[PDB]
Amino acid sequence: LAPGSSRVELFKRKNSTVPFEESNGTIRERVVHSFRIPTIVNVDGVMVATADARYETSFDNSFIETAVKYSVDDGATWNTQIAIKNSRASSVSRVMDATVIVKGNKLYILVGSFNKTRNSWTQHRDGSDWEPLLVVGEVTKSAANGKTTATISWGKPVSLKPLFPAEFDGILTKEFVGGVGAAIVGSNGNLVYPVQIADMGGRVFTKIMYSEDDGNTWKFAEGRSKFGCSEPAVLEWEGKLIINNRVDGNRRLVYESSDMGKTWVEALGTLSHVWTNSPTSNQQDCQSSFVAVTIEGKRVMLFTHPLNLKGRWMRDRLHLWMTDNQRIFDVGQISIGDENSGYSSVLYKDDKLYSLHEINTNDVYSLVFVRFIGELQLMKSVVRTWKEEDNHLASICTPVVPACGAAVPTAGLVGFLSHSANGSVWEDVYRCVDANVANAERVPNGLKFNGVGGGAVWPVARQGQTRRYQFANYRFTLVATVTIDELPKGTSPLLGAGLEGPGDAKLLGLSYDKNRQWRPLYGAAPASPTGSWELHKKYHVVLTMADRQGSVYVDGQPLAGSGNTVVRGATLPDISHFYIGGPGAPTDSRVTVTNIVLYNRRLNSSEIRTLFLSQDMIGT
Numbered sequence: 001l002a003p004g005s006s007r008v009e010l011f012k013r014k015n016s017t018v019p020f021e022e023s024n025g026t027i028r029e030r031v032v033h034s035f036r037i038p039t040i041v042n043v044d045g046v047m048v049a050t051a052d053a054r055y056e057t058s059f060d061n062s063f064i065e066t067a068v069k070y071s072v073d074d075g076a077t078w079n080t081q082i083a084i085k086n087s088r089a090s091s092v093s094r095v096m097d098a099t100v101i102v103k104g105n106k107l108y109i110l111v112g113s114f115n116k117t118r119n120s121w122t123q124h125r126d127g128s129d130w131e132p133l134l135v136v137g138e139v140t141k142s143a144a145n146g147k148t149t150a151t152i153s154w155g156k157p158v159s160l161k162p163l164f165p166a167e168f169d170g171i172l173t174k175e176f177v178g179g180v181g182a183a184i185v186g187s188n189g190n191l192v193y194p195v196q197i198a199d200m201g202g203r204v205f206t207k208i209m210y211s212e213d214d215g216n217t218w219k220f221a222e223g224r225s226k227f228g229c230s231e232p233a234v235l236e237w238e239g240k241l242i243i244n245n246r247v248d249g250n251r252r253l254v255y256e257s258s259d260m261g262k263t264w265v266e267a268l269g270t271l272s273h274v275w276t277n278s279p280t281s282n283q284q285d286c287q288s289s290f291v292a293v294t295i296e297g298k299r300v301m302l303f304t305h306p307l308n309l310k311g312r313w314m315r316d317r318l319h320l321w322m323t324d325n326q327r328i329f330d331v332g333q334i335s336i337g338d339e340n341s342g343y344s345s346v347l348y349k350d351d352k353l354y355s356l357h358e359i360n361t362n363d364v365y366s367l368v369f370v371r372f373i374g375e376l377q378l379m380k381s382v383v384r385t386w387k388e389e390d391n392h393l394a395s396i397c398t399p400v401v402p403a404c405g406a407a408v409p410t411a412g413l414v415g416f417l418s419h420s421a422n423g424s425v426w427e428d429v430y431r432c433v434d435a436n437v438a439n440a441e442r443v444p445n446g447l448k449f450n451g452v453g454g455g456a457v458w459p460v461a462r463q464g465q466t467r468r469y470q471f472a473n474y475r476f477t478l479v480a481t482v483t484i485d486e487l488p489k490g491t492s493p494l495l496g497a498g499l500e501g502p503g504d505a506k507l508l509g510l511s512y513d514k515n516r517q518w519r520p521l522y523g524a525a526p527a528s529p530t531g532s533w534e535l536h537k538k539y540h541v542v543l544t545m546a547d548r549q550g551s552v553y554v555d556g557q558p559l560a561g562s563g564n565t566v567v568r569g570a571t572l573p574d575i576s577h578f579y580i581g582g583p584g585a586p587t588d589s590r591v592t593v594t595n596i597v598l599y600n601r602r603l604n605s606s607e608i609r610t611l612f613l614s615q616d617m618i619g620t
């Protein structure tokens with residue numbers, strides 16, 4: 001966990017007590033084997049932590065009730081209750097998997113309820129022992145002489161089953177549950193719940209169940225995920241709802257929707273497929289928290305997920321990520337060493353960052369309450385860097401084009417390599433994904449390469465487990481200022497996006513040859529000379545790839561062949577990295593490149609001219 005940060009075993013396995021109330025009223029303090037499925041929120045000043053209180057064993061299909069522990073002193077002190085009771089219909093009756101919403105001084109909890117099944121939910125024969133329960137709680141935060149206090153009265157639970165269609169587009173429905181963890185209140189005031197639906201047969205999938213009348217009605221919105229998507233999380237971004245899904249056996253799928261879920265678009269230019277369940281991505285996946293907060297004047301999203309280096313359900317190394325839907329920063333591990341963590345929750349309150357997440361030892365589970373001093377600190381530092389640079393760049397008077405000129409483009413400006421560097425790392429100005437460097441010597445705002453393999457590699461698939469530049473495969477705009485320093489024996493590489501796989505494939509890219517012509521590479525079509533360039537002279541290159549199409553620009557003008565289809569078929573390309581210069585063959589590209597900019601969209605033509613018109617102004 002960050003140096004400075006700390007934690008406390010808030011819901012301690014086999015130690016902590018919950019007031020279990022017997023059939024006939026008596027209430028007894030009772031030990032609880034494992035506490036799993038945490039969520040901690042902030043109802044009007046009073047901290048609320050909800051969880052599965054699994055009395056006898058950690059297994060899903062045993063006896064479970066929803067416990068809370070709220071507080072009015074930022075964790076100094078804590079009270080404990082049992083928010084929802086199970087039916088008590090057998091020795092496995094349970095309510096679980098709370099998905100929580102907070103509006104005003106009310107808490108709307110949504111849990112799955114089962115009576116006697118001993119197998120898990122997707123494999124049930126019908127939905128007859130399952131019920132979707134809605135429960136509301138109200139925080140009453142009265143005080144007393146320099147000492148606030150508070151109560152939470154919980155209401156009888158209400159079943160949502162009569163409002164669940166038997167059919168979705170002809171998909172027979174079996175059962176549903178909320179996504180797990182915190183959901184939200186829409187900026188339009190709706191109560192929105194991401195929910196996971198199992199059909200008759202075990203296919204699972206995701207949807208938005210919302211309320212525009214504070215709890216009284218619920219509507220199942222038109223759109224859905226792909227099959228294999230479960231435990232969705234949700235937040236609102238620039239008028240849109242963004243739904244991050246858990247995906248067993250594959251990479252995490254992300255969808256955006258602008259109509260409260262009526263239509264879903266897969267977020268291929270931003271967050272989809274970036275995150276995953278294990279280095280090899282074929283393991284069971286794991287719940288995540290995905291929360292919109294404002295830090296240092298700026299709205300970012302916050303995302304938690306373990307690396308699972310150990311695999312299966314160990315869920316070691318919980319991580320924390322922060323993104324503005326453009327850049328993605330890895331804050332670090334919020335958990336200690338090789339401990340096995342699990343489902344987590346993050347909460348920003350009165351300028352303090354916190355977490356409530358699982359720890360697992362021999363499958364007996366605890367919930368730790370963590371204080372993110374370190375992380376927050378680091379988080380502000382980079383939000384400061386994003387604002388700081390966005391604004392700078394957005395404040396450069398670029399030249400007026402014969403019709404101050406249009407702004408330097410910063411929207412979806414993902415990364416940028418300028419002046420800061422050394423012999424083996426060109427650093428990202430937006431502090432997220434640096435460049436790996438070789439045989440280079442510094443020049444203002446960039447590197448002059450010279451030597452076998454001199455160039456730089458901006459990891460794309462080579463990034464590894466988490467793939468933060470996953471976007472390039474859908475669209476990108478790669479920009480750079482260059483000169484050719486020495487003529488090439490034949491043809492050498494200048495700037496590109498090269499393909500994972502055997503051989504030496506490139507998606508789109510540009511090279512120069514012995515004749516002083518440019519050789520743009522458009523997918524697998526063979527390079528063919530075009531134009532003229534003059535050693536030493538400064539050129540503005542921009543490579544552009546969208547709609548499976550590519551274009552290359554020199555001096556704001558597109559070279560011949562631009563627009564050529566660059567990849568065939570439905571699968572997205574798997575870009576390995578972007579190359580600057582000439583990072584098998586002993587490639588010695590003798591060039592100097594400076595100020596490389598990266599965008600998650602296809603900049604436009606006037607946008608490209610803005611950059612061409614202002615490249616001697618963007619540098620750090």
Ligand SMILES: CC(=O)N[C@H]1[C@H]([C@H](O)[C@H](O)CO)OC(C(=O)O)=C[C@@H]1O
Pocket residue numbers: 037060096097112120121122230
């Ligand atoms: C209803 C239920 O089974 N809940 C469990 C869920 C589910 O089992 C699985 O995601 C696929 O059905 O999994 C997990 C889990 O740590 O993986 C915890 C949940 O409590």
Ligand SMILES: *[C@@H]1O[C@H](CO)[C@@H](O)[C@H](O)[C@H]1NC(C)=O
Pocket residue numbers: 012014015
């Ligand atoms: C519960 O754990 C606490 C934390 O250290 C400790 O004080 C105490 O020994 C434990 N009580 C039990 C049930 O043994």
Ligand SMILES: *[C@@H]1O[C@H](CO)[C@@H](O)[C@H](O)[C@H]1NC(C)=O
Pocket residue numbers: 022023024025026
């Ligand atoms: C309620 O149930 C418990 C369970 O053993 C019993 O001992 C308790 O005193 C009961 N209360 C009454 C008044 O029966």
Ligand SMILES: *[C@@H]1O[C@H](CO)[C@@H](O)[C@H](O)[C@H]1NC(C)=O
Pocket residue numbers: 087088089113114115128129130131
């Ligand atoms: C489950 O059991 C309870 C307790 O008797 C019953 O009233 C409830 O309605 C049952 N319904 C389901 C979800 O099968």
Ligand SMILES: *[C@@H]1O[C@H](CO)[C@@H](O)[C@H](O)[C@H]1NC(C)=O
Pocket residue numbers: 420421422423424425427
């Ligand atoms: C080079 O600089 C980067 C950050 O600028 C740093 O991570 C690296 O360790 C430095 N030194 C080496 C060995 O390249």
Ligand SMILES: *[C@@H]1O[C@H](CO)[C@@H](O)[C@H](O)[C@H]1NC(C)=O
Pocket residue numbers: 604605606607
């Ligand atoms: C180019 O895009 C910029 C910003 O996204 C915008 O100002 C301008 O209207 C666009 N021009 C075209 C060609 O649509």
